[PDB]
């Protein structure tokens, strides 16, 4: 079933900002923006957590692409393997989300890796969720493409445990 980080870290507010430090050449900037927005939105739809993009300064979730040693002591590994990683909620590096640009990032396709689905997963971690054993969970540790994505009940119950259900 659903899991958290051992110390159950969570955000203390409902309004969270993000910033994209760098883009991937693999996709149009537009496409990337909306990929990340949609990824955040799938968590917004079942919690009171609200995600706002900024273009400057320190955000809660600083997003970048990078490969191998990219300056945080947890290197990436080239093509395949680790797709991306995210830090559990917190100050500084906490919450931040990095993506392996040795991968080919795509949208709506069985080739490459859907930036939408991987962001949505990585951001899940950035919220405090650990992996699920459920094969049809977004928080499964193994990639799967699906043309029509939904949140599994397992993903919804874990996140609602931490931050509660949508008020709207």
């Amino acid at each position: 079933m659903y899991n958290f980080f051992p110390r159950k870290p969570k955000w203390d507010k409902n309004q969270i900002t993000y910033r994209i430090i760098g883009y991937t050449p693999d996709l149009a900037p537009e496409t990337v923006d909306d990929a990340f927005a949609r990824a955040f939105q799938v968590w917004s739809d079942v919690t009171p957590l609200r995600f706002s993009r900024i273009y400057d300064g320190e955000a809660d979730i600083m997003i970048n692409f990078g490969r191998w040693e990219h300056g945080d002591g947890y290197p990436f590994d080239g093509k395949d393997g680790l797709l991306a990683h995210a830090f559990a909620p917190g100050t500084g590096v906490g919450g931040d989300s990095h993506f392996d640009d040795d991968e080919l990032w795509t949208l709506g396709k069985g080739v490459g890796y859907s930036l939408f689905l991987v962001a949505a997963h990585a951001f899940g971690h950035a919220m405090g969720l650990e992996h699920s054993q459920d094969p049809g969970a977004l928080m499964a540790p193994i990639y799967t493409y699906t043309k029509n994505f939904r949140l599994s009940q397992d993903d919804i119950k874990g996140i609602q445990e931490l931050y509660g259900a949508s008020p709207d």
Partner: peptide, 6 residues
Amino acid sequence: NDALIX
């Protein structure tokens, strides 16, 4: 190992 700690 995609969910890190700190």
